[PDB]
Structures are given as structure tokens and as C-alpha cells.
Amino acid sequence: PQYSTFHSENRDWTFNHLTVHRRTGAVYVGAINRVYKLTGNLTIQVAHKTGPEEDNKACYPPLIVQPCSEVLTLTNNVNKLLIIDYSENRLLACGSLYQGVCKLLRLDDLFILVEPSHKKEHYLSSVNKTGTMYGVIVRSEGEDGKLFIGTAVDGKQDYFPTLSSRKLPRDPESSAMLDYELHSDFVSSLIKIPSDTLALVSHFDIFYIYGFASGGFVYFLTVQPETPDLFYTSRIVRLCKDDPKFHSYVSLPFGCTRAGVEYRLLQAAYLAKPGEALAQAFNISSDEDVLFAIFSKGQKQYHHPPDDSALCAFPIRAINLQIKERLQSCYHGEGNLELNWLLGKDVQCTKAPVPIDDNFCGLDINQPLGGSTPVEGLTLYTTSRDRLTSVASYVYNGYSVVFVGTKSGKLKKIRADGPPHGGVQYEMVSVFKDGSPILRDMAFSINQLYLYVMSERQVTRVPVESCEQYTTCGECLSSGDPHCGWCALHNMCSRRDKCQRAWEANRFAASISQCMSLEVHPNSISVSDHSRLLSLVVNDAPNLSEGIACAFGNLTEVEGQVSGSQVICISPGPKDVPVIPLDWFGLELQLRSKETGKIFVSTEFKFYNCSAHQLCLSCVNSAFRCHWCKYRNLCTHDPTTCSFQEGRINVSEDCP
Ligand SMILES: *[C@@H]1O[C@H](CO)[C@@H](O)[C@H](O)[C@H]1NC(C)=O
Ligand SMILES: *[C@@H]1O[C@H](CO)[C@@H](O)[C@H](O)[C@H]1NC(C)=O
Ligand SMILES: *[C@@H]1O[C@H](CO)[C@@H](O)[C@H](O)[C@H]1NC(C)=O
Ligand SMILES: *[C@@H]1O[C@H](CO)[C@@H](O)[C@H](O)[C@H]1NC(C)=O
Ligand SMILES: *[C@@H]1O[C@H](CO)[C@@H](O)[C@H](O)[C@H]1NC(C)=O
Ligand SMILES: [Cl-]
Ligand SMILES: [Cl-]
Ligand code: NA
């Protein structure tokens, strides 16, 4: 029962992030003091060292720019960001060490290509806590490359922008590597947290949980304290892929609701395709993007979110639409921009006869833009105690399958259907024996047979499917597991492509109705009536012509005669018939395929003892075919053994 696994070199060097190379299958783990490159089965190939190093967070600029007067401590370098830059066959890794500098590593050997560190913005943030920074690389065909990066700033609002866009030139040795995409006094590709907002509210900060590119936009999902107990707000922040001025900035709350509970604290997210049921539920094409998200109940307890948590789905289209409607109503002069932490105050929308296209990327007016009314997601599934902590999803055979990690190291497999049910958990695996919470980063092997999952101490490769755990066609085809069918002749629950000869008639059942059944006649015989010929019919069967054998429980196995779906077998002989405990005795009559060697169907077969009854009424009312011999004064299965034909009694009505 043991999956492939990789452990941290040390109990304090916890794992942070994880990514799999879509083309190579190479596995990259971002950890404290280490960046690891691993094989598919999690065999380490390269261990790139990133720490520890003597440092102090008070040291700004960093030690690599300036000598520091502060006392230094050997400091752990937390992986804050880990992203594959596919176009350029390299990996971007940014730690917490030295105010959050970054490295570019070559994919094959993790040899350092460059480490930008002369410019102020080359330092992303001194924050040493995971789950607070996220990046997205965007490189079209005619562009050298771009990096969007959002991060908590820890109150150092003048040191670090909370969101920005940087140059990711193709050439590693470019002097402009990681420079602001645009940098001027009052127009830059960056957002800074106003000093007045930290003054008003501390410890005000903005946490970037997830980010993604979809269509012509980038999206960041954030949590931050609300501004005039502490209440937090989870938001969708959108920008156009092509907008140095950051004029396209817009920000809406989001979350979801079910059964009298509001889930507003964002925990995790993952962009995927809908699957057929959600596509219909959402009225979108099956290859449009859907955001799968985990939220905890309420808007409080950010550092220790309630156990009560939910898996929700947001179609990107529904998001863009609610954003467009917001833009439109603002450019009609309705209401305010409503983004107090940034604008600092109430700013009124400006009416202007500008057409708001699907791909409107902002102007000078009416930006940045907030809003109060939340984007509501579709709640798929909820839990009450084993708090959900991560999420990944993909589509198998038109079914959206969602994997959800829990705080106790469990992995749930949810099958997504639209309303009215939403989602159905069809399995839960125990992944980490130590009960360690599952971290946010999960990723599939290149052909989606496995899902890589991590705790702070461990990376584990978990099979997407374990169909063989279902041992009857009934269990298999009612599990609700999209991967699982019944391999008829091998008596096995498996993937179609794992079932030999699946393409041949009735070899593979995809539906409970396609499960074989077995009819026997007669379905019961007198114990004294041995060596009977029985007629077995196999419903919904495949070719049996290779050969069939009949097994009478443990007692017997004889070669059957096969004609289509009909089998004829000889019942056990005198020595082999079972003895009855004092009226009958049941057992499973089974067919073994000679082609495969496996028992694949069964049904009950009963032996009875008419002699067991010693009174006419008892004999006659037997569940089995018994006859009372009036004169011989006994019960029998064979009426021709009564003394006279006149002695035969079959019904109780004429019992003496
Ligand atoms: C699996 O494990 C062995 C251990 O050395 C390794 O050689 C092999 O490359 C691994 N297979 C993969 C995932 O490529
Ligand atoms: C983050 O900073 C705090 C400051 O007190 C420190 O205690 C903690 O160990 C740090 N986490 C790291 C460097 O792993
Ligand atoms: C999606 O849903 C709406 C409402 O049912 C429908 O009018 C529309 O035609 C559907 N798809 C298209 C073509 O936009
Ligand atoms: C067959 O079944 C009987 C009980 O029904 C058992 O006592 C016997 O050991 C079994 N024979 C085997 C397993 O070969
Ligand atoms: C039928 O029942 C009688 C007892 O009523 C018993 O003596 C006889 O052995 C039974 N036949 C069996 C169990 O084979
Ligand atoms: Cl808290
Ligand atoms: Cl179900
Ligand atoms: Na069939």
C-alpha cells in the first residue's frame, strides 16, 4: 500500500512549493535552504543549496548590497516563489533571505544563471512566511517576457510594492532582468500600500494566495484585513496582460454560500477545465477556464481558519462579466471606486461615454477600481471538522475530478456535478501517516496518472485511481469513481485501458446494469439427487467459448459444457455433496473462465433433505419440492418411491 515518497533532509527545512515540468515530468520542490530536482518516482537528482546564511531582517538594504550594523543570526532561507519559465528552459526561485532576492536556475542542473541584486526592486519582500506571495509569468510570441508578482510586505510599504510587473527578458544576462516593466514618478507597473493605511490599521497586509493567467488577463486571489475583532476580505484582482500603467486594476470580493454558512476566507485555489456537468451548469464551453477554490467559514481568524470549509467553483466568464458590469456602472457615474485601503478615501466614479469592451484595459479615470458586492461561486462540497487546505482538479472522460487536501493529511476525491448536489466525495485517502496538513501546491504527472502532494516534511506521489480496491462489479460500478469500470473476465475493477480485451463484447462494464448475473435451473436439488445436470445462463456475458468450469463452493470443480451464454455442469457426486445441519444448505455456485483463470460470477445454490420432515404438513409446506408418501409415512423428493401412486400427497389440504 506504499506510494513513492521524498523526505526533507532535516526536520526544520520544511517544504514550501512544488511544480512538475509538463514536458519532462521532472519534479521541482521549493524548500527551506534547498531547491530540489527529482525524477518521476521522487529520486533526487540535484539539491541546490540556498541557505542558511547569516542575516537580520532589520538589514536593509540587504547584506549583499550594504554592510549591516545589526547583529546577525544564522537564518533559514524560505522558498517564497517557485515557477518554471518554459520558453527559456529555466526556473525562478525566490527566498526570504536578504530581503527576498531571486535566482534563475537552469532546469537540467539547477546551475545559477543569474541573481539580480543591484536594484531596489530586485528585492521582493522580507516576509518569511509561506502562502503570502504568488507569481505569474506571461510571455506571448513577440514579447521577451513578463513577470507578475504579488506579495505581503510586512509594513515595509516603501521598501516593497504589494503587486507589480517585471521584465523577464529571454536573455539571462540582461541588465534589465526583473526590473519594473515601467518605472516613473507617478506611473509605474506597481501598486504600493499607502502609508496612511498602515497607520490607520496594523498589522495591515495583503496576502497573495494564488494567481493565474486566463485569456487576456492575469488574476490574483488575495486575503487582507478590512478597513473602516478583525475582519478579513478575500478578493479577485485582475489586470490585463498588456498594461504597464496598471490602469486596468480592478478588485472584487468573492466567496460562496451553502446551508446557512458564508465561506469568505480564501485558503487555496486552482485553475482547471469544467467537465461536462459544470460546463452545462455554468453555460460555458467545455474548454473554458474554471477557478476551483477552498474557503473557510466567515471572515475572521485568518491565522487559524475555522475547520468548517468549502470547495467552490468560479467560471472565469462569470468573473469577467461581473467585472465588466462594474466597469460599466462606474463609467456611467454610479457610486464610488470603493477601494479604501488604496484610494484612502471615498472617490466618486466619473461618468464618461467610453464603451466598455470585453477587453477594456482601463484609462486614467476610474482606476484603480474596487467594489463591495461579492462574486458568488458555486459551492460543490463542504466539511465540518477536517478543514480543507488545498485543491487540484482535472477532467477524466468528461468528469471533473477534484482533489482536496485536509489539515490531517487526507486527500479527498470529489466528483463534480452541477446543482442540486454540487459535488460528491467518492473516496478519501490517508496520505500522511503523521497527520501533517496537506500544503497548497499539488500537481499531476504529465499524463495525470499521479498527483504529487506535499506536507511540510514530505512529498508523496499519489495514484489518481485505485480501482482494484473494488472487488465486485457492484462495488466498482457504484463507487462513483469516474476512472473505474468492471473488467468482467478478470473479475477486476480497473481503468478501461487496464482491462485486457476491453474492446470485445461485454468484457468491460461501465454501468451497474452491465454487471453479469447468473441463472441456474434448477436452483436447488435434493441432497440424494446427485450428479444432476444443471442449466446455467450468464446474463450480459462476454464470449465464454474459451472454456468454463463450475465450482460448487469448496466441494467441487468440474468442466462445464458451453453453448453461447449457456453452461451445463454436473452437480457434486455422493461423496462430495454437503451434509445438512438439522433442512437445507446453501453455497455459492461459481464459474471460472478458462481464458483468464478467474472466477467471475456466482449465485446461490441450495441442497435440501426432504427426509428432514417427518410429518405430512411439514413435508408439504417445505420451501423445496418435497412429497409426502401417505402409506410409507415419509417425506421424499422422488414421488415414484411412494408405495402406491395413491399415496402421493403434495398439498397440505389433504394431509391426514
Ligand atoms: C525511479 O527510481 C530509480 C532510482 O535510482 C531511478 O534510477 C529512476 O530514474 C526513477 N524513475 C524515473 C521516475 O525516471
Ligand atoms: C520568521 O521570522 C521570525 C521572527 O521572530 C522568526 O522567529 C522565525 O523563525 C522566522 N522563520 C523562519 C526564518 O523560518
Ligand atoms: C448560455 O446561456 C444563456 C441562458 O440560458 C443562453 O441564452 C445562451 O444562448 C447560452 N449560450 C450562448 C450561446 O451564449
Ligand atoms: C471448504 O469449506 C469448508 C467449510 O464450508 C472448510 O471446512 C474447508 O476447509 C474448505 N476447503 C478448502 C478451503 O480447501
Ligand atoms: C435427512 O434428515 C434425516 C433426519 O431427519 C437424516 O437422518 C438424514 O441423514 C438427512 N439426510 C442428509 C442430511 O443427507
Ligand atoms: Cl487569527
Ligand atoms: Cl455517487
Ligand atoms: Na451489454
Curated annotation (Swiss-Prot):
Subcellular locations according to the entry: Cell membrane
Outcome when changing residue 158 to K: Abolishes interaction with SEMA6A
Family indicated by similarity: Belongs to the plexin family.
Name this polypeptide is given: Plexin-A2
Its biological purpose: Coreceptor for SEMA3A and SEMA6A. Necessary for signaling by SEMA6A and class 3 semaphorins and subsequent remodeling of the cytoskeleton. Plays a role in axon guidance, invasive growth and cell migration. Class 3 semaphorins bind to a complex composed of a neuropilin and a plexin. The plexin modulates the affinity of the complex for specific semaphorins, and its cytoplasmic domain is required for the activation of down-stream signaling events in the cytoplasm.
Subunit structure: Homodimer. Interacts with RND1. Interacts directly with NRP1 and NRP2. The PLXNA2 homodimer interacts with a SEMA6A homodimer, giving rise to a heterotetramer.
Organism: Mus musculus
Section of the entire sequence shown: 36 to 702 of 1894
Cystine bridges: 59-68, 94-102, 240-361, 256-312, 330-349, 467-484, 473-515, 476-493, 487-499, 550-569
Taxonomic superkingdom: Eukaryota
Glycosylation: residue positions: 41, 128, 283, 554, 650
Classification of source organism: Eukaryota, Metazoa, Chordata, Craniata, Vertebrata
Domain Sema per the UniProt entry, residue ranges: 1-464
